[PDB]
Amino acid sequence: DGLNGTMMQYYEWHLENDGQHWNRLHDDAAALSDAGITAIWIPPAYKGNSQADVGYGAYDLYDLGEFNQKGTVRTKYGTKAQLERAIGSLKSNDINVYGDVVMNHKMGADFTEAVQAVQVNPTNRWQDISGAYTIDAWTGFDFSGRNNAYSDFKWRWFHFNGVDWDQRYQENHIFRFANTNWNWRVDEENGNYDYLLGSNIDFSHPEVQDELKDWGSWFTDELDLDGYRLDAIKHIPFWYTSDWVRHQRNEADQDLFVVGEYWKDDVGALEFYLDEMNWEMSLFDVPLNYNFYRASQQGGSYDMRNILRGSLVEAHPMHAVTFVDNHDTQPGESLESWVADWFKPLAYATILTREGGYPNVFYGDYYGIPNDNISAKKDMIDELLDARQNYAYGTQHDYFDHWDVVGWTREGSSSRPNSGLATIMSNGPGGSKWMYVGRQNAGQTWTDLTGNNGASVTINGDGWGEFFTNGGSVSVYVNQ
Numbered sequence: 001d002g003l004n005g006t007m008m009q010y011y012e013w014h015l016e017n018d019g020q021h022w023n024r025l026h027d028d029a030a031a032l033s034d035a036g037i038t039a040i041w042i043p044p045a046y047k048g049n050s051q052a053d054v055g056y057g058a059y060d061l062y063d064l065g066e067f068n069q070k071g072t073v074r075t076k077y078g079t080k081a082q083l084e085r086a087i088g089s090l091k092s093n094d095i096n097v098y099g100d101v102v103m104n105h106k107m108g109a110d111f112t113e114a115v116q117a118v119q120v121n122p123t124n125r126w127q128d129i130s131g132a133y134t135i136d137a138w139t140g141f142d143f144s145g146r147n148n149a150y151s152d153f154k155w156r157w158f159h160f161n162g163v164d165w166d167q168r169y170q171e172n173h174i175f176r177f178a179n180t181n182w183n184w185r186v187d188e189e190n191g192n193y194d195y196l197l198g199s200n201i202d203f204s205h206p207e208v209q210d211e212l213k214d215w216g217s218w219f220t221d222e223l224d225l226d227g228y229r230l231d232a233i234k235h236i237p238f239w240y241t242s243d244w245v246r247h248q249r250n251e252a253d254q255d256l257f258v259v260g261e262y263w264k265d266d267v268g269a270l271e272f273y274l275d276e277m278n279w280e281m282s283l284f285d286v287p288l289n290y291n292f293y294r295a296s297q298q299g300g301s302y303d304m305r306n307i308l309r310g311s312l313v314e315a316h317p318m319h320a321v322t323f324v325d326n327h328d329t330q331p332g333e334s335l336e337s338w339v340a341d342w343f344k345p346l347a348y349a350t351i352l353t354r355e356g357g358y359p360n361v362f363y364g365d366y367y368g369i370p371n372d373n374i375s376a377k378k379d380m381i382d383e384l385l386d387a388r389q390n391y392a393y394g395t396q397h398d399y400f401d402h403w404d405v406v407g408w409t410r411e412g413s414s415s416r417p418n419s420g421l422a423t424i425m426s427n428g429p430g431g432s433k434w435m436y437v438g439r440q441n442a443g444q445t446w447t448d449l450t451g452n453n454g455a456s457v458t459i460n461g462d463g464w465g466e467f468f469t470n471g472g473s474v475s476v477y478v479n480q
C-alpha cells in the first residue's frame with residue numbers, strides 16, 4: 001500500500017553459534033514488521049566449512065542444516081526446519097525474504113587432487129611468478145552425508161581454476177590451475193580479481209553454469225525466496241551473473257528482488273557493472289558506505305555538502321540499496337569501515353528518510369555487537385523507521401547548502417495521513433535552517449521524533465518553517 005520499503009540484514013559477524021538464530025527470526029517477525037521492516041536479508045543458509053562458519057565458507061549449497069556434514073547437521077543459524085518455520089512467519093507478517101547467494105567459490109573440500117598449477121603475482125594475477133608444477137589442492141566434493149538428495153552433482157578440480165593453498169608442499173600462493181584462464185569479465189584490481197579465496201569456480205565450463213542455475217532455482221523454490229543478495233559479484237564473471245539472474249527470473253512465478261554486492265569505493269565501477277547487468281538489479285551503495293565512514297573518522301571538518309557526492313544513490317537512486325554498515329565493515333572484519341556511534345544516527349537518517357535508494361538496517365546496529373561492546377541502537381533506529389514508515393512521503397526538497405548544518409524535507413502525500421517531515425542535522429556546532437515543506441502544511445506544529453531538540457516548529461502561511469539541531473546531532477520533525 002504505497003508503504004516505503006525497508007530491508008534488514010538479520011545477522012552480524014559475531015552472532016552466537018547456538019543454532020538458535022532461525023528461531024529468533026521466527027519470533028522477532030511481527031515486532032520487525034511492526035517497526036517498519038518489510039524485507040529481511042538472511043545470511044548464507046547452507047553448510048559452510050564448519051558449523052561456526054558465518055556462511056561464506058560455503059561447502060554444500062544443498063545442505064541447509066539438514067545433513068550431518070562438516071562436523072554438524074545444523075548451520076550456525078539452525079536447522080532447515082527451523083529456517084522454513086522462520087520464513088513462514090516472515091511471510092505471514094508481510095516481510096519478503098532475500099537469500100544470500102555465494103557462488104564465487106567453495107571451501108571445505110572433502111579431499112585433495114593433483115593439479116598442474118602456476119604461481120601468479122598477487123597484485124597482478126595476469127603475471128605468473130613461477131612455472132607449472134603439480135600441487136595438491138582441496139577440490140574434491142562428495143557431500144557424503146547428503147546422499148545425493150536434491151542433486152548428485154559432485155565437484156572436482158576441473159570445475160575450478162585456482163586456489164590459495166598447496167597441500168603438497170604446504171605453502172600459500174595464488175595458484176592459477178595450468179591451462180585454465182582467470183574468469184572474465186571481472187574486477188580489474190590486481191590485474192584480474194577473479195581469485196579471492198577458497199576454490200575459485202571457473203564459469204567457462206557449461207556444466208558449472210547449469211549446475212548453479214539449476215541449484216539457484218532449486219534453492220529459490222525450496223525456500224520460496226522473494227529475492228537474492230548476490231555475494232562477491234565483482235569476482236564472478238559479469239556475464240554469468242547477468243545470465244544467472246535472467247535464468248532465475250525465468251523459472252520463478254514470484255517476483256525476485258536482486259541486490260548485488262560489488263564492493264568497490266567507486267561509483268563508476270558500480271555503474272559499469274550495472275551497464276553489463278542492464279540494470280536488472282540494484283547494488284549496495286558502497287561509495288556511500290565510505291562517505292559516511294570518511295565523515296565519521298574526520299569529524300566536523302568534513303564538509304557535509306559532499307556527503308552524498310559520489311554515492312550510487314545520488315546517481316541512480318533506483319538501483320541503489322543504501323546501508324551504514326555490515327558484517328564486513330564492523331570492527332575487526334575484512335572490509336572494516338565502521339561508522340562511530342556519534343555519526344551513525346546521522347547516516348541512518350540519511351538513508352531512511354530520503355526518497356532515493358532502498359535502505360537497509362544492520363542487525364549489528366539494531367541489537368548491538370556485544371563482542372565489541374557496541375550498544376544496541378534500536379531506540380534511535382525505531383524512531384527513524386517510524387519516520388520512514390509513516391512520514392517520509394511526498395515531494396522532497398534538499399538543502400545541502402552549508403558545510404555543517406544541512407537538511408531536507410518531504411511534503412507528505414495526501415494518500416498517507418499526517419505524513420511529511422523535515423530532517424535537519426549538523427556534524428559540527430549545531431544550528432537551524434529555513435526550509436520549505438509544502439504550503440499545504442501551513443499552520444501545523446512539527447516536533448522532533450528523535451528527541452534531540454525540543455524546538456516546536458510551526459509552518460507559516462508560505463509553507464515555511466525554521467528547524468533546529470544541536471551540534472553533531474540530527475532531528476526529524478513531523479506533524480505528530
Ligand code: NA
Nearest residue numbers: 104194235236
Ligand atoms: Na571468482
Ligand code: NA
Nearest residue numbers: 289293324337
Ligand atoms: Na561505513
Ligand code: NA
Nearest residue numbers: 300302403404
Ligand atoms: Na562540517
